[PDB]
């Protein structure tokens, strides 16, 4: 089969910039490579087919090039509707393949405000305890949460989830849940979440005593 | 007005037959080719298979012998009959029209197929039984409070605060799929600490699949 | 310049297998098969003269050798002389039960395939001094000629009635170069040299032998008409016969193609040769010529 | 529509010819003979002790 490599996997630019997206093929697929844009939550739509031809209705800002291996797509005069995930799709060999997807987003470093929440007594009656750590309104998206129970580093018993980027302040929020049995929860005193982030010179720890 | 409409098939039990159907309006099944594209959550698109203009069935190598498609010319419908569905097949299935335009390279004429027209989306989830959530408080310059919406199936849950009157500072997180097979999510809001004893905060949780609505007062412990 | 400049994309109403229903179909017809009526309006060329019985798709046009054998009380005498022109005594004679396999290769201006001469190019005319008599040249070494129709044709079937199907050119893709035949330029030049050497024996050593191209007439007589791969070619052969003789490279002959064939120089019995799916390729031996002399 | 109309046209069974089978005898030409097995237990194969021309 043919493998399409699309890099960089995440390019950030503000409104009114020019970006170039790269899609490198394994073999030579001639010029048969079409570009699709997937707005978050919507369905993908055709932008460019045959690596150079603009779809009916696509603005003239979009443009592709190259007929060898290093296919490129150039966007001019960025607008909020262009901040989506782009895919390159080859049509040379019948084992068809897609690109990995280049997520184009908008470009202040801000440390999270951190909060910790003990499990409710109502939950505890069920035999299970959830401890929740909230990381609020931070940028960039990369953040690290480490749970500690009586200073012991926890591993494998948490899950986390992140919001979409805020439209007005460009920040993210993150929620991490540590799941313990009630029996384990009641064997320990100090529950702590330790947060590492670029906006923090040293990790921040929020804790409670059961 | 040319559109491809496909309707939800509801969650299905594992190791069964996945029957999809796309409604073709505006145009007809003849002349083009009709294929299926999926998209696993948080991932890219995947090609399943297509029937070309000739009536010839291209299938993806990964799905071996479990693929079968047909075209209902009388009803203008495209069908998919994936069998032995596994949990990894949880994806949104799209019906596409691979349209042929002839592009002339220097001396060679080719039929170029470029998926002109896309469906709307059929979220297919395979699993657990319908179960409403348990809603627990996340109790509190600025304070944070919230609700933990735990152990429900299937998606989705919606959350508002104070019947929609409180929107500033609200974050409702994507659900996570727990190892139990049940989902959990949290919704939070940041508020002035000075308001915690005077203003009432209620998270309005709605789980339509089980007809479960909860209005949970979140007070300081 | 292309094959597509030789084609007309013709749309017409055709009968269905049900008598009361029609069928809006289309086909690609060569410009040599359609005659305009005065998207213009056309009609098939042999439509005011006859109706074209379709060349039946399951019978092949490939010639198989046939032996003509004499009945009882008769014998076939075979002249084994190697210098026997066509007439007069033959010192070496044999009685064969019947003839060698004679392939009925149908062609004009060039004797494709068949039997070679034994020792030298043979010139055979009924009366060499009469310019109204054709000269049958026979080569001793064959001149290989390669055909092609580079297009990847797409035959399409139309049901014109109950059980009857009409095979039509639906689409043409691939190499769109005009159909052509290649004759080696070195081999053809030395073959005409042998023909000229054996042709000065009847007209003089100091005479000037000049080969011109066909004068005029029907396309079946001005061109090297032949069949190759089930599809009928009509090659120019004006670069073959262009030379004046005084006492890796190849020659490309542009060939046209027809589907409506009046083969045996007759009127009122045409034949529609159906499209051949795919690319047609051709390897034949030019084993002779048919020449006419200018007065 | 009639059933055999996309496959062929139906030549009408001519009304003055009968479908009744009349006995037909298949007779051998000169130089040939028809051997008839008169065995009453002859299945379909093997030797036949009683033969007639
Ligand atoms: C020799 O001559 C031949 C002509 O004699 C040439 O063949 C023709 O070639 C044309 C160009 O390739 C081709 O046009 C294309 O047709 C597309 C639609 O396909 C048609 O026609 C087929 C004919 O066989 C039919 O089989 C199809 O069924 C279809 O016709 C449909 O049929 C329906 C009945 O089944 C009708 O009724 C609809 O039925 C529905 C059922 O639910 C609903 O009820 C509807 O309400 C009802 O209307 C339809 O009306 C009919 N539709 C028609 C007539 O269109 C067409 O999509 C192509 O155009 C689009 O795409 C190209 C490429 O992008 C664009 O350039 C065009 O601008 C146009 O794009 C726009 O629309 C698309 C969406 O469709 C958008 O994505 C896009 O952004 C644009 O907005 C195109 O017109 C001819 O069909 C074909 N004809 C024949 C007889 O085969 C032949 O090529 C030539 N050969 C050579 C060698 O030269
Ligand atoms: C010139 O142009 C022609 C078209 O006019 C090209 O012919 C087509 O080639 C493609 C492959 O390039 C073929 O597609 C494949 O189909 C096979 C199975 O096909 C069978 O069924 C077809 C539908 O009935 C039938 O048309 C096929 O051909 C026969 O019948 C035609 C007449 O209709 C006759 O002309 C032929 O000689 C045959 O007798 C045949 O019975 C399928 O297995 C192929 O593989 C794909 O799918 C598999 C999985 O199934 C996958 O693993 C593979 O990787 C691949 O994706 C593929 O679908 C198409 O059938 C051909 N069409 C015709 C009309 O023959 C021709 O190749 C061009 N030639 C050149 C020189 O470019
Ligand atoms: C096929 O037949 C249709 C009619 O069945 C032809 O369409 C008609 O064309 C004439 C002009 O010659 C118009 O006056 C009619 O109004 C048309 N009728 C329609 C469109 O229903 C059509 O031209 C024929 N196609 C051919 C001969 O290629
Ligand atoms: C059938 O029609 C063809 C085409 O009209 C006739 O051939 C034409 O005859 C005229 C008059 O001599 C010429 O000017 C044209 O050049 C001819 N066309 C072609 C393509 O040869 C033909 O004579 C008609 N046949 C009959 C019997 O009427
Ligand atoms: C002259 O003879 C050759 C050899 O028999 C013919 O070419 C063959 O044609 C048949 C049918 O098309 C093919 O199956 C063979 O593969 C061909 N052989 C080769 C070597 O190409 C050729 O068609 C004849 N010339 C005619 C009849 O004009
Ligand atoms: C066959 O070849 C000849 C010669 O190439 C073509 O006719 C002549 O071509 C020369 C130059 O190539 C011109 O100067 C003449 O005026 C042409 N004579 C004509 C057009 O009558 C000819 O076109 C080719 N094809 C056919 C069918 O004859
Ligand atoms: C002629 O028409 C008949 C009737 O439509 C065809 O037979 C049908 O074929 C379909 C497809 O296999 C079956 O679902 C039906 O049950 C068949 N009907 C009967 C009465 O047998 C038949 O195939 C057609 N013949 C041709 C040559 O097209
Ligand atoms: C052919 O050869 C014979 C014997 O050599 C000769 O008599 C005859 O004249 C030749 N043919 C012609 C047309 O001259
Ligand atoms: C004839 O020769 C030309 C080049 O002179 C070549 O492109 C073509 O393929 C040849 N065709 C055949 C049938 O040999
Ligand atoms: C004809 O084709 C054969 C192979 O099919 C090739 O060997 C030969 O050189 C060709 N000759 C000409 C004159 O094109
Ligand atoms: C013969 O060649 C001349 C030009 O050399 C051309 O005008 C004429 O049409 C040709 N005749 C044919 C190919 O029958
Ligand atoms: C042409 O003749 C040679 C021998 O002279 C033979 O080997 C070859 O097969 C012939 N080519 C054909 C009949 O296409
Ligand atoms: C029929 O009978 C003969 C003689 O008895 C015997 O040999 C033969 O096997 C029988 N047929 C079969 C099918 O057994």
Numbering used by the authors:
A (entry chain L): 1 to 107, 109 to 211
B (entry chain H): 1 to 82, 82A, 82B, 82C, 83 to 100, 100A, 100B, 100C, ...
C (entry chain A): 148 to 185, 188 to 309, 312 to 323, 323A, 324 to 397, 411 to 458
D (entry chain E): 192 to 244
Please give me the paper's original passages concerning this structure:
Broadly neutralizing antibodies (bNAbs) targeting the HIV-1 envelope protein (Env) inform vaccine design, hold potential for therapy and prevention, and advance efforts toward achieving a functional cure. On the HIV-1 Env trimer, bNAbs recognize highly conserved epitopes essential for viral entry. Here, we report on the identification and detailed characterization of the new anti-HIV-1 bNAb 007 targeting a N332gp120 glycan-independent V3 epitope of the Env trimer.
Thus, in an attempt to investigate bivalent IgG interactions with Env trimer structurally, we incubated BG505 SOSIP with 007 IgG and imaged by cryo-EM. Rather than observing intra-spike crosslinking, the most populated structural class of 007 IgG-BG505 complexes contained “trimer-dimers” in which two SOSIP Envs were crosslinked by Fabs from three IgG molecules. However, the distance between the C-termini of the closest Fabs on the opposing Env trimers was 13 Å, consistent with these densities originating from a single IgG. The observed trimer-dimer structure would be compatible with Envs attached to separate virions, thus raising the possibility that the 007 IgG neutralizes at least in part by aggregating virions. It should be noted that the SOSIP Env trimers we used for structure determinations contained specific mutations (I559Pgp41, A501Cgp120, T605Cgp41) that decrease the sampling of alternative Env conformations, whereas neutralization assays use membrane-bound Env trimers lacking these mutations. Structures of 007 IgG-Env trimer complexes showed two Env trimers crosslinked by three bivalent IgGs, and bivalent 007 IgG was up to ~300-fold more potent than monovalent 007 IgG heterodimer, suggesting a role for avidity in potent neutralization.
